Amino acid sequence: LSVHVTDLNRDVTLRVTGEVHIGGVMLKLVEKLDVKKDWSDHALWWEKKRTWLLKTHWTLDKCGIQADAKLQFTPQHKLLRLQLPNMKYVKVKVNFSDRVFKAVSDICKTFNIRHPEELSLLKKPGILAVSQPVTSPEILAKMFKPQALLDKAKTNQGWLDSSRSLMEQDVKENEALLLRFKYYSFFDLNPKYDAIRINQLYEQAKWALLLEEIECTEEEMMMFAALQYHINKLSIMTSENHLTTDVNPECLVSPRYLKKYKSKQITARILEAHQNVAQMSLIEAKMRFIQAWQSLPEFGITHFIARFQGGKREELIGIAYNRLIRMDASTGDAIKTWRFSNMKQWNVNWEIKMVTVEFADEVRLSFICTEVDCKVVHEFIGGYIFLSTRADEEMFYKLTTSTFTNITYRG
Amino acid sequence: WELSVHVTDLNRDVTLRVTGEVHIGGVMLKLVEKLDVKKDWSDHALWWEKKRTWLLKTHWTLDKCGIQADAKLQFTPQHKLLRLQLPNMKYVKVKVNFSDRVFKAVSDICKTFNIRHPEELSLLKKPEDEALELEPGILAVSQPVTSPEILAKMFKPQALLDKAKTNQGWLDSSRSLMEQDVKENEALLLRFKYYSFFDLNPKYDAIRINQLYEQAKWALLLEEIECTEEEMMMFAALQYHINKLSIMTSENHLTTDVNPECLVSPRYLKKYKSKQITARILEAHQNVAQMSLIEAKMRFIQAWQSLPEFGITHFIARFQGGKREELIGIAYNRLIRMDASTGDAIKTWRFSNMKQWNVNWEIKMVTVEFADEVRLSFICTEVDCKVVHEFIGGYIFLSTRAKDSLDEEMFYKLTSGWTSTFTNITYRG
């Protein structure tokens, strides 16, 4: 066995039986390496078979490791540059051996974000809560992409397999991944807990509109623009520690408090309370932005390249929280819509790379995508269904030629 | 015999020769004919202050009305001027029908002021500054007082017995303003009477919510309702916030260090110049702050509603097993027996468990019949009997409001006066 230690950049030849446990190989090297530093988080990785040799109690015979096979001994945790929904990069350390879903779950608790199942990873300290507009229009124009439907549909091929690890999906250390809200069904947006969660969701929406990733009318746009201007004003209040109006604070309390406190003591306790008032007004203002965003006709759709039965042209399959949509690749016009509530079950033919959905009233849908898109779309369908049952991390992996049944089929 | 009839607006007395079989309309014609004036008589009606009733039924005879000889009648216009103090403590002059039932009068007043659900509001007699014309911004604009001195000068006794005295002034919704000793150009209080607000919708109730917020704000400022110091400073913060939000709705200029062009997609920088982008954004922002304003006032009301002493109307009453004058308290869902000194709740009954209730007008006693034959009986002052009765019937009628026209006839059924008996329409089980 040739074993490469990644961080020390050294290859080690090891004498192997075939009956010795994986933990044995680890034991054989630590004695052979004889180094005074911590090996606690290192694990064996087999890039030839793109699988972790995590089950340590098992033997080499069960794993089938041939002679002169190139194994790696690598730390599970690596550094990863994540771009938040606010388009700001943050450096964090994540487990490259954990399932992506669990990885995202841990990240959200770290970032203080509830319901991580709404978020995922996409291929290309007070910063988590503060939201500020750019300094100049040039910054926006410099970030501008074509944002055409085919450009977006291509990007959606990058959604990671939530049931696999980071290492199995061609992600090296210090590469850039996008942290994004993947499913557009937001459950319980509670201002009492989700100050950071709501802020990022608002930011994701704000950029999507600014960078024309989603379309809206001029009236809608000016409305969204006004909200940002409003939200910035509210933000200033949360930091303001002074009277900034022409109103006497003593006019806002009952006269019995004029006897108990001096004028400065009233101005103080009101401003303290006002900061808490504006803090919730801030969150609720961002809530309205999101609500308007949610009500847009083109909201909540994820596009994938697909050809439908009897089709002569390139088209788009679109997945929303409540429906699947056949779309024109140029205009985005809805050709036909099937609703998820009317879905009994669905089929995935991995050979032909075809998805088939069965609905009530014997309605049947069939289309064909890229093979990568098949796993992505499969996870999207099962995910949106799994999210509809919120009132269980294991069930998410259950729902993500295979056949799966909609648990919420009525009739 | 002879009828002496005074025409109020013309300041003239007229002696009329009457049979006693002559119709009410006959008196009116004889009056118009003897006066010999080229005047509009459309809104005049006969009024009898001795018997304190309107003679509106024109087809009746003087005998059916029971009009004695030499009785002093008045011929007066039905619509008169009335000074109303809004919940924002500002007075407004409006013209209302003094012959209509108060319930309809309030309804007419509220649609004039653009306030939905008038059945929640009514008119209250004063237990200084009573003159101002009808303007649109007196109804919608909310501004804090100019000095702490204003609060101390408007301060009234807020003890429970003071409240019970004030609540003696609630008008009979089934009678008219004239029948209840209300002269023209007098001051009445327009207030939210019942504390069960159905569908407070910011899309329509910009004025309704504002006035309701004002009533709550003043009740707290004038210490008519109690709250903790944390709560008080919170309400104080809210006002400071609401004033700031209000200022924004009029501001038509940039007052931040942020460039407005950073708030739109780059496609609009080519279509518009910087000035019109700053303009159209400010135009939309005013409506944004306008909705923030309403939502802030809504939160104020919600906090107000959540206060432990909220939504209770107090009346002086003597109970059966009582050694003392005590207080009966009426909330939207319950009746409460209270100690007049401490304000402690002795016992509470639910409206849901109420089958029916009786009113002995002679003894001035109200008796409520509940499930499990538990029975409550008390006695109030003369005036309070009809008043307390109207509060009970009203709150029940308000419980029948569903998301589905207001059965005005039903309201008078549950709050009718002159031993009568009334049945809970919302009795569960």
DSSP assignment of A202-260: HHHHHHHHHTTSS---HHHHHHHHHHHHHHHHHHHHTT--S--SS--GGGSS-THHHHH
A212 → chain B, closest CA residue: B265
- Non-local (6+) Cβ contacts of A93 within 8 A are A77, A78, A79, A80
Tokens (6 digits) for B42:
């459309």
DSSP A66: -
Going by the DSSP 8-state scheme, the letter that residue A109 receives in this structure is: H
At position A229, the amino acid (one-letter code) is Y
- Interface with chain B: mutation pick from A87, A210, A230, A254, highest number of B CBs within 10 Å: A254
Contact A255, A225 (CB under 8 A): no
Q: Do A281 and B292 touch (CB under 8 A)?
A: yes
Handedness of CA A145, A148, A154, A157 (dihedral sign): positive
DSSP B243: H
What residue type is B427 in one-letter code?
Y
Rg (CA), chain B: 26
Contact between B155 and A270 using a beta-carbon 8 Å cutoff: no
Residue with tokens 């509470």: B348
Q: What is the resolution of this structure in A?
A: 3.0
Check residue B408 and give left, alpha or beta (phi > 0: left; psi -120 to 50: alpha).
alpha
The torsion angles phi and psi of B300, rounded to 5 degrees, stand at -55, -50
Quote the strand ranges of B305-411, DSSP E. Answer: 313-319, 325-330, 334-338, 345-350, 354-360, 365-370, 375-379
Q: Do A221 and B264 touch (CB under 8 A)?
A: yes
Instruction: Report yes or no: B185 and B82 within 8 Å, Cβ to Cβ.
Output: yes
Partners of A315 in the β-ladder: A306, A328
Nearest residue to A250 via CA among B243, B221, B223, B241: B221
Q: Name the nearest CA neighbour of B188 among B100, B313, B108, B86.
A: B86
From CA B57, how far away is CA B402, in angstroms rounded? 36
Supply the DSSP symbol for A333. Answer: -
Q: What is the DSSP letter of B261?
A: G
Least CB–CB distance from A229: residue in B235, B239, B285:
B285
Asked if the Cβ–Cβ distance from A229 to B148 is below 8 Å, we say: no
In Å, how far are A12, A212, A336, B54, B398 from B328, measured between CA atoms? 91, 63, 64, 34, 20
Give the technique used to solve this structure: X-ray
**Are the beta carbons of A177 and A123 closer than 8 angstroms?**
yes
Give the pairing type, strands B79-85 and B187-192. parallel
By the 8 A CB rule, do A59 and A30 touch? Answer: no
Q: Which two tokens mark B84?
A: 């109303």
Residues in chain B, total? 429
Q: Which residues of B touch A236 (CB under 8 A)?
A: 256
Give the contacts of A189 (CB within 8 A, at least 6 positions apart).
A197, A198, A201, A287, A290
CA A349 to chain centre: 27
- Binary contact (A225, B295; C-beta < 8 A): no
CA-only gyration radius of chain A, Å:
27
Q: Which residue in B124, B225, B115 sits closest to B169, CA to CA?
A: B124
Q: What are phi and psi of A168, to 5 degrees?
A: -75, -5
> A94: which residues sit within 8 A by CB, 6+ positions away?
A77, A78, A80, A103, A106, A107, A166
- Chain A residue with the nearest C-alpha to that of B276: A222
Burial state string for B176-212 with b = 16 or more CB within 10 A and e = fewer than 16:
bbbbeebebeebbbbbbbbbbbeebeeeebbbbbbbb
Helix locations, B168-228, DSSP H: 206-221
Q: Is B295 helix (H, G, I), strand (E, B) or coil?
A: helix
**How far B104 CA lies from chain A's nearest CA (Å)?**
36
Separation CA A222–CA A238 (nearest Å): 25
Per-residue CA distances from B48 to B67, B162, B249 (Å): 9, 34, 52
**Cα–Cα distance, A122 to A182 (Å, whole number):** 9
Interface residue of B231, B240, B270 to substitute, partner A, most A CBs within 10 Å: B240
